[PDB]
């Protein structure tokens, strides 16, 4: 009766494909839903069309589409819903709900906290610099700032500075330029990313460059598919499947 359709954005890097597929597969045992299919927007199969049609072929009357996204931008608002309407037009009797990106969640703040703790340096009254990819969509900066504020409330750090690799300000290179000082305050750098790659490597090199000026700077590993990220995503899945007020009804559009 009920189905879950997981939708990742997809990758062409084999390791990223494998990690995303394995994560979504391991999610299934935590959800009491008989029909569950994984799919990806781009670059990686099963396609969204394939997964939706598989759900229908297994007899699903209700499909909960849950996007595996850290933040809310064009993928969550447009590309994925567009693919959903394209495939769903062929099955008008099937009810669809559509979930939210992870966004501002206490579990993800805990994931950031454990990445900080992994460095093994005291974090009390330390500065945190939270680097997101960035986007021209203001919701992305808004959500990263919200995550910084939640971290500020939950962990006794001096401050959390959200900044970005591209598209919106402040740029992380500007923050870095202002941190060449070394005033005795410890600064942790947390990359808010699901995968490694070119930008993560750039962050690594720039942190080396910064450490040449200020030795009290420590880069954590990127967040990745941390257990607390898994908790937050399972929260998204469960709330989308319950859809108790119809707030996740998939209405034609975005
Ligand atoms: Fe924990």
Swiss-Prot record:
Gene Ontology BP annotations: siroheme biosynthetic process
Disulfide bonds: none
GO MF annotation, one: metal ion binding
Induction: Up-regulated by sulfur starvation and repressed by cysteine. Also induced by O-acetyl-L-serine (OAS), a direct precursor of cysteine, maybe via inactivation of a putative transcriptional repressor of the cysH operon whose activity is controlled by the intracellular levels of OAS.
Binding residues annotated for Fe cation, in chain numbering: 9, 75
Catalytic activity: siroheme + 2 H(+) = sirohydrochlorin + Fe(2+)
Entry EC number(s): 4.99.1.4
Highest taxon listed in the record's lineage: Bacteria
Keywords: Iron, Lyase, Metal-binding, Porphyrin biosynthesis
Pfam family, one: CbiX
Pathway in which this enzyme or protein is active: Porphyrin-containing compound metabolism; siroheme biosynthesis; siroheme from sirohydrochlorin: step 1/1
Function: Chelates iron to the siroheme precursor.
Protein name stated in the entry: Sirohydrochlorin ferrochelatase
The encoding gene: sirB
